[PDB]
């Protein structure tokens, strides 16, 4: 009974950052060495946990958040960051514990002419709270006039599409990001390593 880390990392398609997937992981054996002993990652940044010192530790739940962002925006996947992605799409708490993992996925998530399938929220009245997901597509009202769900002046669609093209520079290229979150409540521990 091993933990299904392969499902989230090996997934054929990832979610848009505004609709980031969260995989609940429990009552399984966690071989974390399949992750850190790899060489396909360009960013493996851990906060407050040692990935090699979790095999002897047990948790109640582990969350694997997955989505695709730009290379420029990977720096926003970190506690205490600001920007379009941290404020409006995916926010980490200041006391975040876990690892954020990213790797270049130009070969998979970029199509000639542009993928235009991965989206990110561009407009929002207020910043997201940590670990909050907003899938609203309501027309963003930038003025005093109600929009009645129609686009136009002072009325913007809150979602914008990434221009993922193979020609683009490295920072513009799509990057698949997996964020590992560790939870330890008073419930019995179910996620143990070898």
């Amino acid at each position, epitope marked *: 009974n091993l933990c299904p880390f392969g499902e989230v990392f090996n997934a054929t398609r990832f979610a848009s950052v505004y609709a980031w997937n969260r995989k609940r992981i429990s009552n399984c054996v966690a071989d974390y060495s399949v992750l*850190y*002993n790899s*060489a396909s*990652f*360009s*960013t*493996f*940044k*851990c*906060y*407050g*946990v*040692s*990935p*090699t*010192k979790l095999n*002897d*530790l047990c948790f109640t739940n582990v969350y694997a958040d997955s989505f695709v962002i730009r290379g420029d925006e990977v*720096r926003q996947i970190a506690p205490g960051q600001t920007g379009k992605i941290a404020d409006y799409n995916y926010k980490l708490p200041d*006391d975040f*514990t876990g*690892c954020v993992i990213a790797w270049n996925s130009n070969n998979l998530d970029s199509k000639v002419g542009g993928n235009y399938n991965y989206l990110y929220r561009l407009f929002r009245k207020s910043n997201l709270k940590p670990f909050e997901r907003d899938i609203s597509t309501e027309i963003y009202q930038a003025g005093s006039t109600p929009c009645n769900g129609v686009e136009g002046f002072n009325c913007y669609f809150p979602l914008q599409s990434y221009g993922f093209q193979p020609t683009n520079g490295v920072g513009y290229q799509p990057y698949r990001v997996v964020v590992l979150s*560790f*939870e*330890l409540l008073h419930a019995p521990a179910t996620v143990c390593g070898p």
Partner: antibody
Amino acid sequence: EVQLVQSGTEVKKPGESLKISCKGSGKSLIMYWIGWVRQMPGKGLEWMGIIYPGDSDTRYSPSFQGQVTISADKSINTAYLQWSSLKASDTAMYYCAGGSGIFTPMDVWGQGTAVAVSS
Amino acid sequence: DIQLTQSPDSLAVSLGERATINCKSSQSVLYSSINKNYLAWYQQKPGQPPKLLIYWASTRESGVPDRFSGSGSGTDFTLTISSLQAEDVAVYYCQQYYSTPYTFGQGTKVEIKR
């Protein structure tokens, strides 16, 4: 299998510039944060700063903020600790240590680099 | 910054006896989300770089013999060597990685009481 190897012993005169290096090797290196520790002759350990080589996330101790510059070059898996003008008070053994995250104990240590600043 | 103080500065226990080293923290290094104190113990033989003995105040690094044991919680911690062997002569440091900047203890010198 992560290990750290440092540059050789340095003897310098006050006011000169020095740049010692810390090269790491092995799998799972991309997740190791590289920090520097100073140990003056006969005294204890002082934490100077830390850097994540993936994006050059540099964090300094307040005692050493502005006195040294900590950088890295992720192309060759090498981190650096540099001085603009050395002082005689900088005569100490310098270690580089690695840990698999921020707020994680330093697992891998280098062999140390002796630095002597004298006229 | 979090300050750590050790006691005694020097310790002398006989071969096969027990060595106890205390580490006291200015503030708590416990963390509720993991319920593990972010405390580490290091050993530095003369002319050698420091080596990590115990992390999270109780768990030993791989290859550390069982005679090393860490205990304590919050602001008080102790490092215990059950059967002091001649190869355990070094200076032992406690260090917190709870918050930047990292800070070490002043160090404890352990000798063989002959």
